[PDB]
């Protein structure tokens with residue numbers, strides 16, 4: 202039962218997450234079932250990870266085949282899946298200069314790799330945005346712009362300056378010839394699906410290039426085609442110096458990547474970085490399968506179409522609790538006129554939908570890219586009652 | 593072909609590992625096969641990760657079963673495998689106070705969690721050993737005692753003091769009432785399987801206890817039953833405040849853990865730490881299978897028995913290049929009288945064996961716990977010619 206599972210959790214787990222309110226038993230596609238038999242339509246994807254939902258046959262096949270061929274070896278040895286995955290990610294980025302890949306296990310680790318890259322420029326100053334999220338390890342936590350998550354762990358590694366997200370003048374003023382790198386999410390996810398103004402990413406690219414700073418785009422949450430281009434920054438026609446990926450990269454299997462373009466790709470020399478599990482054949486095979494399905498089923502273009510319709514349906518409700526809808530593709534935020542997002546998360550759960558109160562007044566959606574339009578339509582139809590009950 | 597695979601590696605991978613000398617295509621048990629069809633007996637286990645070797649049926653079964661049931665959910669939801677794994681790990685530690693578990697993806701992340709735990713004591717000073725290896729992310733790299741690997745990324749998170757490993761009075765002098773934590777490997781793996789003097793870990797436990805500092809034992813490489821006890825520190829009759837695990841924990845699947853005992857288990861409160869993939873059902877299911885097999889097949893005792901026989905066999909060779917063999921169970925270092933370990937790595941490869949030159953004069957072995965006695969016997973018999981060819 203849910204009570205029994207929660208009691209077991211509380212007896213053994215550290216309390217860094219609190220106690221989960223529901224205990225899940227099974228999942229298939231975009232539908233999960235708790236241990237008491239209740240079903241839920243998953244509009245959150247385990248926080249943007251389950252790009253292909255649960256039990257996707259291509260991921261299952263890839264993992265099973267690879268485990269029956271060759272498992273972990275470490276990077277003392279070259280293995281096919283990681284090399285092929287690196288080739289595919291480089292092709293997807295489409296940079297004009299040579300691009301090189303480092304594999305790791307998580308978004309924090311990918312940003313730690315980028316942090317270490319920035320040190321090799323000879324500069325130690327870094328710029329990120331207030332309310333940005335880049336991970337929880339000591340280096341990535343310094344880049345994260347969330348004082349609540351940071352101050353108990355001070356001092357953090359330096360020297361980071363945080364500026365208002367989307368503020369071109371503030372960014373131009375903070376970046377100078379001592380700035381190693383600027384880290385930006387193309388849409389701030391954890392903060393509440395905060396989309397920057399038109400032209401902001403292009404300004405960031407110009408500012409950084411002019412001052413010799415690396416532009417690092419954290420695509421851990423916005424990548425994997427979620428916004429209707431493989432990398433969200435591709436909507437703005439820029440090429441950053443470094444891109445980080447994780448979350449949906451392995452369709453559920455733990456894997457992250459740091460891609461570096463041009464001179465930044467040559468900064469790491471032998472012995473200067475590594476990760477034991479990085480690039481392992483099983484997780485790389487899963488990620489290769491995810492890329493294959495995204496391509497074969499046209500899921501990147503589909504995410505744009507479904508997200509546009511979803512945004513319009515929510516806006517068409519005219520519900521007084523909804524201030525506006527924001528995001529792109531299948532990363533969407535419902536900004537509320539009053540801080541009832543946590544209550545709306547609960548009432549959505551009662552109605553069988555998994556959503557996220559990303560901020561007191563923002564409901565975040567990040568559904569599997571395989572979600573059916575009917576499931577999105579059903580959520581839109583359920584939303585007025587969900588919101589009425591929240592207040 | 594090896595040349596084509598290595599050329600593909602060099603075209604796309606960052607150069608932080610150099611270029612691997614061989615490309616592996618398949619593995620089964622303790623035997624791996626390269627792309628040219630050559631077989632090698634794996635005495636390194638992918639750097640102590642493949643505790644059950646490749647294609648172990650219990651791991652394959654657990655992973656395939658869980659993938660066909662429920663994949664990643666995130667820790668917004670309670671799920672069975674992670675809870676059960678935490679329960680099993682707490683039982684194996686056998687501490688007398690309540691122990692709590694945090695899951696992550698890697699050894700670096702496990703030590704980052706411990707690093708952040710130590711911040712919550714109210715102190716910022718940390719002590720580790722010269723030549724210790726604790727990971728490559730910014731926080732874990734500050735603990736790692738390798739200036740050549742740390743200097744390029746300075747400044748690192750503070751305030752860390754390094755002391756000579758095994759030196760009781762040096763540790764006592766460095767630990768004071770401002771020390772948050774001492775980090776120690778029970779045997780220094782990366783440095784060359786450096787075993788501390790008898791009583792040293794117990795002295796570290798006493799020194800930290802008297803000064804109010806946490807004792808953090810990094811069992812990422814020494815754990816998983818490799819030394820003949822589940823945790824290597826259990827040979828010494830102490831209970832640390834924090835234990836970190838990774839590498840072999842998932843039999844190859846990426847997973848790490850931070851266990852904290854007593855008051856240290858309560859430091860992390862809701863929202864203060866997390867990892868998206870941490871505790872996911874698939875990797876936790878693999879780890880549970882590893883624990884089941886270690887117990888059912890008596891592999892922890894087997895590691896002690898085979899380790900003793902292996903050490904005795906190598907020493908019985910009376911080879912002039914071998915100074916001594918050190919370590920415990922199936923973590924062994926062959927310490928040489930001259931710096932030919934790197935050459936011996938290549939000549940061992942020529943003879944069909946994968947070993948590691950951990951230091952210029954130390955060959956490290958960490959074979960799967962399922963390795964055949966005859967596979968070890970063949971290595972010992974081949975070792976004289978391997979060393980003669982190396983010189």
Ligand SMILES: O=C(O)c1cc2ccccc2cc1O
Pocket residue numbers: 275276277472474475476477608609610728
């Ligand atoms: O994790 C590491 O730091 C690492 C470094 C290497 C350095 C040279 C070759 C292989 C390596 C494999 C690793 O996992």
Ligand SMILES: O=C(O)c1cc2ccccc2cc1O
Pocket residue numbers: 217218219337666667668863865866867868869
């Ligand atoms: O990685 C995190 O920081 C994280 C924090 C949580 C905090 C509360 C509940 C669930 C959470 C899940 C996460 O992955």
